[PDB]
C-alpha cells in the first residue's frame, strides 16, 4: 500500500507491452505495429519466468521478494478488470496501449442553462 | 441542482454528426406538413 | 419549492412517456391520447377507446387510427366468439414507433451503401425516395411517379428501385405484419389440433407431439414470407430491361435494417481488438455477409413458451444448426472476401486466433462468424465500458471482480487490488444502487437478523441489463421532452418565419436556439447507438 503497487503495476504492464509489440511503432500509425508483425507468425508466446527476471533486474531493497503468490495476484489484478487473458497468460492486447496515449472525449462538460450532469440521478 | 453524481461521455461539441440532425429535422418537418397530422 | 430539476415527471412515467413523446412531435396530439391507452391497458375496442379517452367521439377515434395504421403504429386483430359478433381489436405496434424513433439513420445508412455512382444521384433523388417511403408509409409506384411533370428521366428511379429491393430494405407491404405475434401462433396452434381425429391416448395427449413439430414448420413458412422473394423480383419482359413488377405497393423492413446496424457495434469491437487494416478486412467481410444473416429474435420464442424443458434447451441448439447450414454465408473464402491473397488470409487467421468469440469454428478451412456465442460478449463488453466511463474505473474493477469467480466474498475483494474499509464499501453500495451487486444473506439466528448474519455478493445477470435498458429509454424520453420546451418559446417565431420564402436581438435568439436544437439530436443518435445492444439478444 499504496503507490508502489501502482509503480510495479506500471512497470510490469510496460514489460508486457514491450515483450509483445515493439516500442518504436506505438506513438504513430505509420504502417501500424510494423504492418502488425508483417502478417504475424506462429510465435504466440509470453514471459514464463521472464517477468520475474525483469522484476529481479530492478527492485527496491525492501522485502518484496514475493514470488508465486503476489505474481498471480497481480496477474488476476490485470485480468479481474482488464486485458486479454487467453490460455494461461498468452499475448496481452486490446486497447490499453491507445488508452495510455472509448477514445477522444475532450471538452466535457458545458456549464450553461442546458445539459450535463442530468444523468445517473436516482431513478 | 440535486444531481451532482458524474456525467456520461456523450456530451462534447466535437460531433461531426451535423448532417444527421438536419436529416432528423427535415423528416420531422415533412411528417408535420403531411396530411396525417390530427393535432389538438 | 421551485420545482425546476424535472421532478413532476421524474418517476411518474417510464416505458410509455417515450412512446407518447415520439408521437407527439410527429403525429399531432390526438394520436398521443389513443396511443397512451393502448400501452397503459392493452387490448381495447373502438367503443372502449371512446369511453376511455373521455373527450373524443367515434368520428375522432376512428380517424386517428387510420393515421396510425398508415405509419403502422397500430396492430390489427379481428376476433370472434362462440355466438358470433365479429369485431375489431387494436394493439400498440412497437416497430412503427421504432421507425418513428430512428427516422434519419434509415436515410443515413442507405446513403453510405451504394457503389461507384457517388455524389451525383444520392443526394437529391433517393434522399426524397426513401423519405417519402418512411413518411407516407406503404407506397406504390404508379401513384408516386405522377408527381413529376414531363418525366424525361423516368428510368433513373427504376435503376435505383430494382437494386435496392434486391439486396434488402424494400419489401412487400404488411399483409402479414399488422397481425400480432401471439394470435398468428395461437390460430396456427389450434388449427393443427382440432383437425386431428380421435385416436389412442398414448400418455393421454400425444397430439402435443405433432402440434409441436408441424405447426412450427409452416410457421417458418410465415417467417419465410418477409424475405427476398422471386415473386416480385426478376420479372423478364421481352425486348426490354430487367425490371420488377411496379403494380403492388411496397414498404421498408425493420429486420434487415437492425442486423446491418449490429455490424456497427461489431466494427467497434473489431477496432477495440485490432487497429486499422485487419479491422477493415473484418469490416468488408461482414458487410459482404449482411442480408442472409440470422436476425434479432424470431417470433417462435417471442411468445408462446409452453414451459417445455426440451424446447428451451434445444431452441439455441437448432439455432446453431441454422447457423451451420446456410446457402452461402458460411462460404467466407479468401478470394470471395478479396473480390469486393495470403496476407489477408494471415489477418483472417489472426481473427481465428483472436479468441474472443468472433470468426471461429473453422474445421475444413472455410471460415464463419458465429453470433449466438457472440451476443453475451457484445452485450457485456459495452456494459463494462459505461461504468468505467461515467462512474469510475475503480467501480469497473469492483464490478468485474465479482464476475472473475462466482460469488467472491467480502474477505477476498480486499485481498485483490485495493485495501479495505476506505472506498470499497462506498463503491460497492453505489453498485448496489445500480443493480449490479445483488446482495444475499446467511443468518446465525432464528429470525434472519442483520447483526448475526453475513453476506454474499453475486452479480446476477438480466437485472443489470434490463435496468440500464429502461434507464436509456428513460433518458431518450427526457431528451425529446426538452425539445418540446423550446417549441413553446418559439411558437411566435417559427410561425412568423415563413413569409420570407433586422432587429439584431433576434440574431442572439433565433440563431442561438438552433445549435441547442441540433445538439440534442446529435446526442440522441449516440443514445440510439448505445441503447441498441440491449435489444439484439
From Swiss-Prot, chain A:
Localisation: Nucleus
Homology family: Belongs to the eukaryotic RPC34/RPC39 RNA polymerase subunit family.
Quaternary assembly: Component of the RNA polymerase III (Pol III) complex consisting of 17 subunits. Interacts with BRF1/TDS4.
UniProt function note: DNA-dependent RNA polymerase catalyzes the transcription of DNA into RNA using the four ribonucleoside triphosphates as substrates. Specific peripheric component of RNA polymerase III which synthesizes small RNAs, such as 5S rRNA and tRNAs. Involved in recruitment of Pol III to the preinitiation complex. Involved in the configuration of an initiation-competent form of RNA polymerase.
Protein name (database record): DNA-directed RNA polymerase III subunit RPC6
Organism in which the protein naturally occurs: Saccharomyces cerevisiae (strain ATCC 204508 / S288c)
Organism ancestry: Eukaryota, Fungi, Dikarya, Ascomycota, Saccharomycotina
Swiss-Prot record, chain B:
Note: The acidic domain is essential for its function.
The protein's name: DNA-directed RNA polymerase III subunit RPC7
Tree of life domain: Eukaryota
Assembly and interaction partners: Component of the RNA polymerase III (Pol III) complex consisting of 17 subunits.
Function: DNA-dependent RNA polymerase catalyzes the transcription of DNA into RNA using the four ribonucleoside triphosphates as substrates. Specific peripheric component of RNA polymerase III which synthesizes small RNAs, such as 5S rRNA and tRNAs. C31 is involved in the formation of the initiation complex.
Family: Belongs to the eukaryotic RPC7 RNA polymerase subunit family.
Location(s) in or outside the cell: Nucleus
UniProtKB/Swiss-Prot annotation, chain C:
GO molecular function: single-stranded DNA binding
Pfam families named in the record: HTH_9, POLR3C_WHD, RNA_pol_Rpc82, RPC3_helical
Signal peptide: none
Gene Ontology CC entries for this record: cytoplasm; nucleoplasm; nucleus; RNA polymerase III complex
Subcellular location(s) of the protein: Cytoplasm; Nucleus
A GO BP entry: termination of RNA polymerase III transcription
Stretch list, region Leucine-zipper: 472-493
InterPro entries the record matches: POLR3C_WHD, RNA_pol_III_RPC82-rel_HTH, RNA_pol_III_Rpc82_C, RPC3, WH-like_DNA-bd_sf
Top-level taxon in the UniProt lineage: Eukaryota
Keywords in alphabetical order: Cytoplasm, DNA-directed RNA polymerase, Nucleus, Phosphoprotein, Transcription, Zinc
Function description: DNA-dependent RNA polymerase catalyzes the transcription of DNA into RNA using the four ribonucleoside triphosphates as substrates. Specific core component of RNA polymerase III which synthesizes small RNAs, such as 5S rRNA and tRNAs.
Other comments on record: Present with 2520 molecules/cell in log phase SD medium.
Similarity comment text for this entry: Belongs to the eukaryotic RPC3/POLR3C RNA polymerase subunit family.
Self-association and partners: Component of the RNA polymerase III (Pol III) complex consisting of 17 subunits.
Protein name as annotated: DNA-directed RNA polymerase III subunit RPC3
Naturally occurring in which organism (per UniProt): Saccharomyces cerevisiae (strain ATCC 204508 / S288c) (Baker's yeast)
